[PDB]
Design a protein around this ligand. Structure first.
Ligand SMILES: *[C@@H]1O[C@H](CO)[C@@H](O[C@@H]2O[C@H](CO)[C@@H](O)[C@H](O)[C@H]2NC(C)=O)[C@H](O)[C@H]1NC(C)=O
Ligand SMILES: *[C@@H]1O[C@H](CO)[C@@H](O[C@@H]2O[C@H](CO)[C@@H](O)[C@H](O)[C@H]2NC(C)=O)[C@H](O)[C@H]1NC(C)=O
Ligand code: NAG
Ligand code: NAG
Ligand code: A2G
Ligand code: A2G
Ligand code: A2G
Ligand code: A2G
Ligand code: CA
Ligand code: CA
Ligand code: CA
Ligand code: CA
Ligand code: CA
Ligand code: CA
Ligand code: CA
Ligand code: CA
Ligand code: CA
Ligand code: CA
Ligand code: CA
Ligand code: CA
Ligand code: CA
Ligand code: CA
Ligand code: CA
Ligand code: CA
Lengths: 423, 423, 71, 5
């Protein structure tokens, strides 16, 4: 067990016992970084994350080795993840496509199962009961419930809500818990939305986002505090600050290998995957429904799958105005060979500077050997080009150009206020 | 009328099936989950007719056989061919049973070697080769010998609808199919089944549809036997307890002078305590004579042939000679025989709910007006507190002959307000 | 609501060009809940030979062979 | 406001 939480700068894993402070998992970080959604795969010692600066979903071991991407194609503001550990399906919520997607990890297979939402945020799925829950915070705010296959969508909590940011589930009692950030409250109810109850006032909670339930504690993240706070899961509780000064803070999650235990008919033994090709989804009252990816239809047997190009034609990775990377991502067509890795695979900066693959107008081209470099690297006193074309015959004329009389002038022709001299 | 999504002909007896029920040609609606699954449920096979199961497709949650039937998903890989085509047991990778200690059945079922021919079929395999009943060569009376394997099974399960023997002796055409059971038996109509002559017409339902009890059964429910006494309530009792001093029939039919109890002279050496009255039996067995218990109404059985009692200073000494504890005083019970315990008492009044009689006796409120003289003086059966005056049925209320008097706007309105149109 | 506008199931008024535009302008499904009208007609310089389902550049019409199976 | 920055 350990507490897994996300932020702008890093994805971290922390022991629950506040007595010790050191991480149990390597931080996840990049040069451009804004992590939001997270979840874990206990059977592989694996976590997942999104990064809104790259629009990719990743997977990485706890040790840090074996980073791989899940997808990079048609992701728009992936505000949350959740993982069905029995079916091995990953669900996410595109706040920009305004939809929720499910993907099977065994072989990349994806469908938008719910499509016409307004501002969906947290999603959480309960494999043994076969339900998924998601929050929407458009004016008529609500919490939905649906069968894991993305059908029977119906609201279970639509009264006295505004901004219902984070959902979570108590596995030990089959109670849904949720934050609301417009009335500054945390509530809980049965999976049917009945028997609704409210926790007491929490000190200095003003706007919560992430929520988690583990053992007898409720873990919450407040954007106005920029902290992780802990309360007793039955009542107002003894508000105990876990972390502070954690920058822009996002979801929390409780890593627990004991939780990820069980089997629906979707992965009972003596057969595989509940006999479905491509997907099976656990459905409430101990049953399974098969699924098919985009562009495929279930056959007469309702289990095996067939091509359906008539209704859902095959689609390109990218439009006519964008370059499809080797990675599933998509970049503007004039970002090819600009000297900057935009595809996050160096796929847009491959074999550049040749005929039929010229440098962008923005970049500077080395005269020999086919290498394009960023414009900002042209004559900045560093030999960037392999042949040194970028540091040859550029203006030395500082000219009679002068900074205002208010500003002191350095020998480098940079100017600063006279107030800054000799500090 | 055009039943079953207007695709089918059913005789129009005016009654209809529900929304979720299939209709058969002969009626007896069946639930949609029973439609097309190898089980005949309509009797005529309307739920399994090839025409009906031609267009029908399996519900999303049910396994589809290669044949086209729709079995519940939990039937898949359960060793046992319920699909008929074995299409739900095809491809099943069963665990290899430890053959050194278990037995691997012909259907792949794992069972301990100790359970081989242990007395009952465990494998249930198509081969049936578990329950060969190895050690004995035959079965004795109070059971039939099963035919090809020698299991002791009562004929009482012949033709009953499942193979009790695992061998067809309980389904043998040799019997039940040929002629109607043994001389000591009768055959049920539903299921088709030989059953004992002491189930047939016995006062209870023993077939599934009660065809063992079809209204014409002996004289009556109190037909009993030449060895059994006959009771007005329909109960049958042993003739030994007739006029023994206590109700055995359950309706006092064996304890009255109305039929016969005038000469209830008891068996052999029983002491005849003539002090006893019909509320108790005069004859008492010598088994508990002088046993220290007040068998007779005044406990003369404890002095007539009994050793004297020394009694105790801590117990109530009856003036007559009996000895009892202080718990047996002031309780309306003649423990001492000479009423020495109840004489001179000052019984405190009855409880809040408790009813009081004229003779001061306390009786439960529930025991008022039940045709039993529970007060002894008949206080609980007094006309004034027991008779319920019929409603006055004034102006606005017409007393029709049924007694259920109706509103006077309804007189001869041609709507049957009072049973057989009494208005 | 004004006759210029559709009244959505949540009480919004939306202009009746945007109904059936393919996007839920009401933020409820109201303005796309009943929008079937999308025929198999072919635009641009194509031609749809009557009673036949193919569509062909109009240069082939009277090119001197029947492009479509019968006249 | 409550939108992810
Ligand atoms: C808010 O959610 C409730 C359920 O908690 C909805 O009430 C149901 O409404 C449907 C019809 O839309 C009825 O068939 C159900 O019986 C109602 N209750 C149950 C048991 O679900 C209610 O309609 C929702 N309101 C809004 C504005 O969506
Ligand atoms: C653009 O230029 C590059 C280099 O001249 C070409 O690269 C080759 O492309 C083929 C087909 O994809 C590969 O099998 C070769 O291995 C590539 N490299 C070499 C050295 O042959 C590329 O084909 C050009 N593209 C176009 C459209 O002309
Ligand atoms: C089978 O049973 C034998 C005897 O008890 C035991 O030694 C052996 O380990 C068992 N093997 C398996 C695979 O169960
Ligand atoms: C086994 O199955 C076949 C049908 O495939 C059946 O005819 C046969 O009687 C079965 N075996 C036994 C021992 O009854
Ligand atoms: C094309 O887009 C559709 C949805 O519009 C699907 O996502 C499909 O998988 C896409 N095709 C490829 C090759 O990514
Ligand atoms: C060569 O390719 C690059 C890719 O960024 C630009 O499109 C460029 O404009 C192309 N050609 C020339 C001559 O500039
Ligand atoms: C320096 O440049 C500034 C800004 O253009 C003024 O023109 C200023 O007069 C210049 N100084 C001299 C000495 O020419
Ligand atoms: C059978 O499959 C068809 C599609 O081929 C329909 O989904 C139909 O609803 C299914 N059967 C039932 C009873 O739902
Ligand atoms: Ca607030
Ligand atoms: Ca680039
Ligand atoms: Ca440089
Ligand atoms: Ca300075
Ligand atoms: Ca059936
Ligand atoms: Ca089976
Ligand atoms: Ca056996
Ligand atoms: Ca039988
Ligand atoms: Ca009977
Ligand atoms: Ca009796
Ligand atoms: Ca006695
Ligand atoms: Ca007494
Ligand atoms: Ca009474
Ligand atoms: Ca009437
Ligand atoms: Ca619209
Ligand atoms: Ca032509």
């Amino acid at each position: 067990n350990f507490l897994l939480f996300s932020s702008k700068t890093a994805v971290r894993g922390i022991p629950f016992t506040l007595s010790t402070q050191e991480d149990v998992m390597v931080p996840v970080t990049g040069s451009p970084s804004f992590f939001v959604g997270i979840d874990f795969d206990a059977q592989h010692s694996t976590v997942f994350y999104s990064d809104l600066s790259k629009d990719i979903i990743y997977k990485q071991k706890i040790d840090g080795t074996g980073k791989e991407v899940i997808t990079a194609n048609r992701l728009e503001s992936v505000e949350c993840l959740t993982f069905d550990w029995i079916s091995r399906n990953l669900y996410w919520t595109d706040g920009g496509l305004k939809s929720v997607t499910v993907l099977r990890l065994a072989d990349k297979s994806r469908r938008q199962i719910i499509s016409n939402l307004n501002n969906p945020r947290s999603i959480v799925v309960h494999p043994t009961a076969g339900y998924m829950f998601l929050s929407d915070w458009f004016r008529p705010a609500k919490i939905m419930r649906a069968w894991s296959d993305g059908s029977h969508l119906m609201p279970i909590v639509n009264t006295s809500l505004g901004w219902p940011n984070g959902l979570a589930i108590d596995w030990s009692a089959s109670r849904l818990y949720w934050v609301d950030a417009f009335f500054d409250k945390i509530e809980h109810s049965t999976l049917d939305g009945l028997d609704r109850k409210r926790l007491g006032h929490v000190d200095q909670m003003t706007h919560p986002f992430g929520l988690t339930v583990f053992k007898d504690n409720v873990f919450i993240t407040d954007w106005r505090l920029g902290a992780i706070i802990r309360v007793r899961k039955s009542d107002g509780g003894d508000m105990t600050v876990i972390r502070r000064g954690i920058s822009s803070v996002m979801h929390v999650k409780a890593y627990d290998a004991d939780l990820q235990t069980g089997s629906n008919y979707c992965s009972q033994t003596t057969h595989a995957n509940g006999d479905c090709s491509h997907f099976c989804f656990p459905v409430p009252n101990f049953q399974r429904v098969c699924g098919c990816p985009y562009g495929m239809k279930l056959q007469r047997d309702q289990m095996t799958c067939e091509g359906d190009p008539a209704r859902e034609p095959p689609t390109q990775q990218c439009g006519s105005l964008s370059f499809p990377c080797n990675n599933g991502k998509c970049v503007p067509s004039f970002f090819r060979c600009d000297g900057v890795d935009d595809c996050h695979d160096n796929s847009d900066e491959h074999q550049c500077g040749v005929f039929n693959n010229t440098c962008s107008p923005s970049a500077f081209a080395c005269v020999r050997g086919g290498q394009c470099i960023p414009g900002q690297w042209h004559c900045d006193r560093q030999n960037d080009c392999l042949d040194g074309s970028d540091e040859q015959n550029c203006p030395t004329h500082a000219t009679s150009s002068t900074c205002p009389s208010t500003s002191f002038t350095c020998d480098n022709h940079v100017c600063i206020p006279k107030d800054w001299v000799c500090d | 009328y055009l039943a079953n999504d207007n695709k089918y002909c059913v005789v129009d007896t005016g009654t209809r099936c529900n929304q979720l029920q299939f209709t058969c040609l002969n009626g007896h609606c069946i639930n949609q989950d029973w439609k097309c699954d190898n089980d005949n449920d309509c009797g005529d096979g309307s739920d399994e007719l090839p025409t009906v199961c031609a267009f029908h497709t399996c519900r999303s949650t049910a396994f589809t056989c290669g044949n086209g039937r729709c079995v519940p998903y939990h039937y898949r890989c359960d060793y046992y061919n319920d699909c008929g085509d074995n299409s739900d047991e095809a491809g099943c990778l069963f665990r290899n049973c430890n053959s050194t200690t278990e037995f691997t059945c012909s259907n792949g079922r794992c069972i301990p070697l100790s359970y081989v021919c242990n007395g009952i079929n465990n494998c249930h395999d198509n081969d049936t080769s578990d329950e060969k009943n190895c050690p004995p060569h035959t079965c004795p009376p109070d059971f039939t010998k099963c035919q090809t394997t020698n299991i002791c099974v009562p004929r009482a399960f012949l033709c009953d609808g499942d193979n009790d023997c695992g061998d067809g002796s309980d389904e043998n055409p040799i019997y039940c199919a040929s002629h109607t059971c043994r001389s000591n038996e009768f055959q049920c109509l539903s299921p088709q089944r030989c059953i004992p002559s002491y189930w047939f017409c016995d006062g209870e339902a023993d077939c599934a549809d009660g065809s063992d009890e079809p209204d014409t059964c002996g004289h009556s429910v109190n037909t009993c036997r030449a060895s059994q006494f006959q009771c007005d309530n329909g109960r049958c009792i042993s003739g030994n307890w007739v006029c023994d001093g206590d109700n055995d029939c359950g309706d006092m039919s064996d304890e009255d002078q109305r039929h016969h109890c005038e000469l209830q002279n008891c068996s052999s050496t029983q002491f005849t305590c003539v002090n006893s009255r019909p509320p108790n039996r005069r004859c008492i067995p010598q088994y508990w004579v002088c046993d220290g218990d007040a068998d007779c109404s005044d406990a003369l059985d404890e002095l007539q042939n009994c050793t004297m009692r020394t009694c105790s200073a801590g117990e109530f000494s009856c003036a007559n000679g009996r000895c009892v504890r202080q718990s047996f005083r002031c309780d309306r019970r003649n423990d001492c025989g000479d009423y020495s315990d109840e004489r001179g008492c000052s019984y405190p009044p009855c409880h809040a709910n408790q009813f009081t009689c004229q003779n001061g006796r306390c009786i439960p409120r529930f025991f008022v007006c039940d045709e039993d003289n529970d007060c002894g003086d008949g206080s609980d059966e007094q006309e004034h507190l027991c008779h319920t005056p019929e409603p006055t049925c004034p102006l606005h209320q017409f007393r029709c002959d049924n007694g259920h008097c109706i509103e006077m706007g309804r007189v001869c309105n041609h709507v049957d307000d009072c049973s057989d149109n009494s208005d | 609501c004004s006759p210029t506008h559709f009244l959505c199931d949540n009480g919004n008024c939306i202009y009746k060009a945007w109904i059936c535009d393919g996007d839920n302008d009401c933020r409820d499904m109201s303005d796309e809940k009943d929008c079937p009208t999308q025929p198999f007609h072919c635009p641009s310089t194509q031609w749809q030979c009557p009673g036949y389902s193919t569509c062909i550049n109009l240069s082939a019409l009277c090119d001197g062979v029947f492009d479509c199976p019968n006249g | 406001x409550n939108x992810x920055x």
